[PDB]
Design an enzyme around this catalytic site. Structure first.
Site, PDB file in Angstrom:
ATOM      1  N   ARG A 157      63.450  20.692  34.952  1.00  0.00           N
ATOM      2  CA  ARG A 157      62.381  21.796  35.743  1.00  0.00           C
ATOM      3  C   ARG A 157      61.038  21.789  34.931  1.00  0.00           C
ATOM      4  O   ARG A 157      60.283  22.809  35.311  1.00  0.00           O
ATOM      5  CB  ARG A 157      63.282  23.096  35.830  1.00  0.00           C
ATOM      6  CG  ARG A 157      64.377  23.129  36.643  1.00  0.00           C
ATOM      7  CD  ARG A 157      65.006  24.387  37.421  1.00  0.00           C
ATOM      8  NE  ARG A 157      66.241  24.335  37.862  1.00  0.00           N
ATOM      9  CZ  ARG A 157      67.393  24.359  37.235  1.00  0.00           C
ATOM     10  NH1 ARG A 157      67.147  24.554  35.906  1.00  0.00           N
ATOM     11  NH2 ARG A 157      68.461  24.501  37.706  1.00  0.00           N
TER      12      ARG A 157
ATOM     13  N   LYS B 187      47.018  17.228  39.443  1.00  0.00           N
ATOM     14  CA  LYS B 187      47.783  16.337  40.422  1.00  0.00           C
ATOM     15  C   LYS B 187      48.642  15.322  39.969  1.00  0.00           C
ATOM     16  O   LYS B 187      48.367  14.511  39.311  1.00  0.00           O
ATOM     17  CB  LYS B 187      46.637  15.937  41.521  1.00  0.00           C
ATOM     18  CG  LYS B 187      45.813  16.693  42.569  1.00  0.00           C
ATOM     19  CD  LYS B 187      45.148  16.025  43.563  1.00  0.00           C
ATOM     20  CE  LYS B 187      44.622  17.044  44.392  1.00  0.00           C
ATOM     21  NZ  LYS B 187      43.613  16.361  45.458  1.00  0.00           N
TER      22      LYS B 187
ATOM     23  N   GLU C 111      32.437   7.364  40.547  1.00  0.00           N
ATOM     24  CA  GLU C 111      32.916   8.710  40.860  1.00  0.00           C
ATOM     25  C   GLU C 111      32.016   9.554  40.244  1.00  0.00           C
ATOM     26  O   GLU C 111      31.791  10.618  40.378  1.00  0.00           O
ATOM     27  CB  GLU C 111      34.441   8.758  40.542  1.00  0.00           C
ATOM     28  CG  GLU C 111      35.526   7.994  41.278  1.00  0.00           C
ATOM     29  CD  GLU C 111      35.689   8.744  42.682  1.00  0.00           C
ATOM     30  OE1 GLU C 111      36.150   8.076  43.348  1.00  0.00           O
ATOM     31  OE2 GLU C 111      35.324   9.867  42.597  1.00  0.00           O
TER      32      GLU C 111
ATOM     33  N   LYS D 258      33.445  18.272  36.965  1.00  0.00           N
ATOM     34  CA  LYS D 258      34.722  18.633  37.547  1.00  0.00           C
ATOM     35  C   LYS D 258      35.491  19.753  37.101  1.00  0.00           C
ATOM     36  O   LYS D 258      36.052  20.587  37.720  1.00  0.00           O
ATOM     37  CB  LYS D 258      35.701  17.457  37.680  1.00  0.00           C
ATOM     38  CG  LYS D 258      37.036  17.570  38.456  1.00  0.00           C
ATOM     39  CD  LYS D 258      37.837  16.285  38.792  1.00  0.00           C
ATOM     40  CE  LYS D 258      38.940  16.580  39.799  1.00  0.00           C
ATOM     41  NZ  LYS D 258      39.866  15.755  39.838  1.00  0.00           N
TER      42      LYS D 258
ATOM     43  N   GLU E  11      39.780  26.442  46.271  1.00  0.00           N
ATOM     44  CA  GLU E  11      39.051  25.498  46.961  1.00  0.00           C
ATOM     45  C   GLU E  11      38.499  25.990  48.128  1.00  0.00           C
ATOM     46  O   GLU E  11      38.717  25.381  49.167  1.00  0.00           O
ATOM     47  CB  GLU E  11      39.771  24.421  47.345  1.00  0.00           C
ATOM     48  CG  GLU E  11      39.173  23.086  47.888  1.00  0.00           C
ATOM     49  CD  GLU E  11      40.055  21.735  47.856  1.00  0.00           C
ATOM     50  OE1 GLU E  11      39.611  20.849  48.386  1.00  0.00           O
ATOM     51  OE2 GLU E  11      41.333  21.739  47.478  1.00  0.00           O
TER      52      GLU E  11
ATOM     53  N   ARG F 276      34.648  23.578  44.951  1.00  0.00           N
ATOM     54  CA  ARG F 276      35.583  22.418  44.787  1.00  0.00           C
ATOM     55  C   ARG F 276      35.876  21.220  46.012  1.00  0.00           C
ATOM     56  O   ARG F 276      36.128  20.370  45.703  1.00  0.00           O
ATOM     57  CB  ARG F 276      36.897  23.062  44.671  1.00  0.00           C
ATOM     58  CG  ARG F 276      38.063  22.284  44.238  1.00  0.00           C
ATOM     59  CD  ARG F 276      39.250  23.275  43.676  1.00  0.00           C
ATOM     60  NE  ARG F 276      40.162  22.299  43.078  1.00  0.00           N
ATOM     61  CZ  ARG F 276      41.362  22.779  42.499  1.00  0.00           C
ATOM     62  NH1 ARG F 276      41.735  24.094  42.357  1.00  0.00           N
ATOM     63  NH2 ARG F 276      42.194  22.148  41.861  1.00  0.00           N
TER      64      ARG F 276
ATOM     65  N   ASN G 136      35.212  16.113  47.679  1.00  0.00           N
ATOM     66  CA  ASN G 136      35.336  14.968  48.692  1.00  0.00           C
ATOM     67  C   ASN G 136      34.045  14.374  49.423  1.00  0.00           C
ATOM     68  O   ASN G 136      34.236  13.530  50.401  1.00  0.00           O
ATOM     69  CB  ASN G 136      36.043  15.533  49.893  1.00  0.00           C
ATOM     70  CG  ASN G 136      37.686  15.964  49.717  1.00  0.00           C
ATOM     71  OD1 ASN G 136      38.308  15.418  48.663  1.00  0.00           O
ATOM     72  ND2 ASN G 136      37.967  17.052  49.908  1.00  0.00           N
TER      73      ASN G 136
ATOM     74  N   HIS H   6      34.261  10.600  50.783  1.00  0.00           N
ATOM     75  CA  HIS H   6      35.725  10.421  50.907  1.00  0.00           C
ATOM     76  C   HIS H   6      36.246  10.235  52.386  1.00  0.00           C
ATOM     77  O   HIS H   6      37.313   9.762  52.974  1.00  0.00           O
ATOM     78  CB  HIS H   6      36.863  11.328  50.204  1.00  0.00           C
ATOM     79  CG  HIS H   6      36.559  10.742  48.775  1.00  0.00           C
ATOM     80  ND1 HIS H   6      35.455  10.906  47.864  1.00  0.00           N
ATOM     81  CD2 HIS H   6      37.227  10.187  47.773  1.00  0.00           C
ATOM     82  CE1 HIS H   6      35.513  10.748  46.856  1.00  0.00           C
ATOM     83  NE2 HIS H   6      36.908  10.290  46.658  1.00  0.00           N
TER      84      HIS H   6
ATOM     85  N   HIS I 102      37.761   7.171  53.073  1.00  0.00           N
ATOM     86  CA  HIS I 102      39.354   6.850  53.555  1.00  0.00           C
ATOM     87  C   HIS I 102      39.334   6.086  54.751  1.00  0.00           C
ATOM     88  O   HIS I 102      40.342   5.116  54.828  1.00  0.00           O
ATOM     89  CB  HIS I 102      39.880   8.144  53.551  1.00  0.00           C
ATOM     90  CG  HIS I 102      41.296   8.257  53.735  1.00  0.00           C
ATOM     91  ND1 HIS I 102      42.245   8.612  52.895  1.00  0.00           N
ATOM     92  CD2 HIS I 102      42.299   7.706  54.886  1.00  0.00           C
ATOM     93  CE1 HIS I 102      43.609   8.539  53.414  1.00  0.00           C
ATOM     94  NE2 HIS I 102      43.433   7.852  54.498  1.00  0.00           N
TER      95      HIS I 102
ATOM     96  N   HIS J 226      39.770   2.123  46.492  1.00  0.00           N
ATOM     97  CA  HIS J 226      38.919   3.557  46.527  1.00  0.00           C
ATOM     98  C   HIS J 226      37.517   3.397  46.034  1.00  0.00           C
ATOM     99  O   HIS J 226      36.769   3.779  46.685  1.00  0.00           O
ATOM    100  CB  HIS J 226      39.928   4.181  45.520  1.00  0.00           C
ATOM    101  CG  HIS J 226      39.320   5.731  45.503  1.00  0.00           C
ATOM    102  ND1 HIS J 226      39.713   6.432  46.717  1.00  0.00           N
ATOM    103  CD2 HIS J 226      39.155   6.539  44.877  1.00  0.00           C
ATOM    104  CE1 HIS J 226      39.321   7.549  46.569  1.00  0.00           C
ATOM    105  NE2 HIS J 226      38.782   7.722  45.277  1.00  0.00           N
TER     106      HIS J 226
END
Lengths: 338, 336
Positions: free
Chosen positions: B109, B131, B173, B210, B220, B224, B228, B231, B235, B244
């Site tokens: 956990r 993430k 990036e 960042k 966000e 924040r 993107n 992207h 994408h 990417h």
């Protein structure tokens, strides 16, 4: 209808009574419902009442708490394209909420879930704590997540189809809370049945105890680890029986041992209440066991009940444990449980 | 040596430089290390330095993020009997910390983990945000958890053996961060190589951007979402074989054109420089309708360095920009 509230670390209501579905806030987004095949009838009722169109039935039991079933449920949700604002409804006993809660905790990194417990153990124990997870070949509950439900709705009408032994297993956990809190009312179970008109109040009282202990000690440095009363020996028994011995039964056996430890340390006599519990419970007889073959399944701290509401956590001289185990065996032999 | 600090919601240090291993606090309890089998040399150095004995090699790409690998790593940890106070050390690129951080988030956990990124992209993009996760047959990154590392230690020596294309991907990036924060220094990438003594400060500057945006906009609802930038089309280009990093660069060009059409300053010059330096694989022929199936949707539009807006856009404007986008690419020898 009884309404309890968990405040920390995350707030949510716990409803216990008949007609709990009317108390569920209408869903504000997409949803899916996971259920134990054993209670499909109620599962379909929950789905119809709340407008849920995606349902997946699973066999209950420990087999549901596996990586395979976990992956299956996740892909099932993905296949339907359920978004991050979706809600997962889980209808079943402890194994279903364990699995379903973990799926909710990790699908898209976390979505809300509602619990609809259908066993006494799930009502008394799984409604508080946020513990979710699955098993691995290497051991029980080794993978999981602390993820709290957005609400818990215990429909008592669902407990009527519950096997009596399973029904009683949950009452053992309530009994345990009684010893922990010093609540004499929770030690009174001999008359309880799925039909008992006083059951609702009893279950609500049982849940209320775990709520209090949990909020006062969120760091398990105090009262919270008292919830492990009877679990040290209980765990050892479950392991030795290859898990054939149901959890609640193991706890009952562990409670007798704890009571004997308390007596040896000069605590009040708690054997009568526990003996009563065991006779009413009728736990399955245990296989021969020696203190020497016990150690493996047992540095260690035991939760010792010196008096209802007055317990201590500490290590004990092996000589005391050995003595208590011998008396424990005799106590059980004098009942045919050994 | 650069030391950055993440404060919210969970504090932890991010070290970027040469000799980062000495900066790691001695391990307080048991530990195990997971590594991209392609960087075993460095993994062993990490293990030997911190006293870790349990090491497990794994695939270094998206392949590592399967339910199978996830299950294998968990049983391997259980097999070794690692307790709740154990620390998982993860050595590799973004995919490795995705898998490793998710294992750390769910084993018992939750247990602590330390990240040792081995790519520029991982340093610039995976050191912040917490993430973690894995893939499903139905799609990538559909299972996971937000679980922050106890520390990020980026050893620049490990970047020396990094293939140039991959090395540049992380720089794209950083460039994106430059446009978001309005930092001209982050737009100057053309002279950077794995051995540039200037790289350390560059990477730290990119990371700091960042950290800023994420701590100022937790939910966000503001700054924040600017992360993107590029992207949406990026994408779309991928989801329509293209890496990417490369897709983002193409996305930045499109974003610059949108800004031009929305009364912004001319941001094409910096992007053209980026694309010429990057030399991404030329794009095969394509029409608007080919990407449309991936384009209600709020776009990140750069009006000026450090001045961006998030908003939905008319299909007409999108078509106009795409036409200009194709002509720009022809001039850069990247289309037709």
């Amino acid at each position: 209808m009884q309404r309890l509230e968990v405040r920390e670390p995350v707030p949510y209501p716990i409803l216990v009574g008949e007609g709990v579905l009317k108390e569920v806030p209408p869903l504000a987004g997409p949803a899916a419902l996971l259920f134990d095949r054993r209670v499909e009838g109620f599962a379909q009722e929950v789905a119809k009442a709340l407008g849920v169109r995606h349902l997946l039935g699973l066999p209950g039991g420990e087999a549901a708490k596996s990586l395979e079933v976990y992956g299956k449920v996740l892909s099932w949700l993905a296949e339907k394209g359920l978004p991050r604002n979706a809600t997962l409804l889980v209808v079943g006993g402890g194994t279903l909420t364990d699995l379903g809660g973990f799926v909710a905790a990790t699908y898209l990194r976390g979505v809300a879930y509602l619990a609809f417990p259908t066993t006494t153990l799930a009502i008394v124990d799984a409604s508080v704590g946020g513990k979710t997870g699955i098993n691995l070949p290497e051991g029980k509950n080794l993978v999981g997540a602390f993820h709290f439900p957005q609400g818990v709705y215990a429909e008592l009408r669902a407990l009527k189809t519950l096997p009596l032994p399973t029904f009683k297993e949950g009452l053992v956990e309530a009994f345990k809370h009684g010893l922990i809190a010093g609540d004499e009312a929770l030690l009174k179970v001999e008359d309880l049945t799925p039909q008992s008109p006083r059951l609702e109040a009893f279950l609500a009282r049982a849940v209320a105890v775990k709520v209090r202990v949990t909020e006062e000690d969120p760091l398990e440095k105090g009262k919270r680890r008292l919830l492990n009363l009877g679990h040290t020996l209980g765990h050892a028994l479950e392991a030795q029986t290859r898990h054939a011995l149901p959890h609640g039964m193991a706890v009952a056996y562990g409670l007798l041992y704890a009571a004997l430890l308390g007596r040896a340390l000069g605590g009040e006599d708690l054997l009568p209440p526990v003996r009563r519990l065991l006779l009413w419970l009728s736990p399955p007889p245990l296989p021969p066991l020696a203190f020497e073959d016990l150690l493996p399944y047992l540095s260690l701290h035991w939760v010792v009940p010196l008096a209802p509401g007055r317990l201590v956590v500490r290590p004990l001289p092996e000589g005391l444990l050995r003595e208590a185990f011998a008396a424990w065996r005799e106590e059980l032999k004098g009942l045919g449980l050994l």
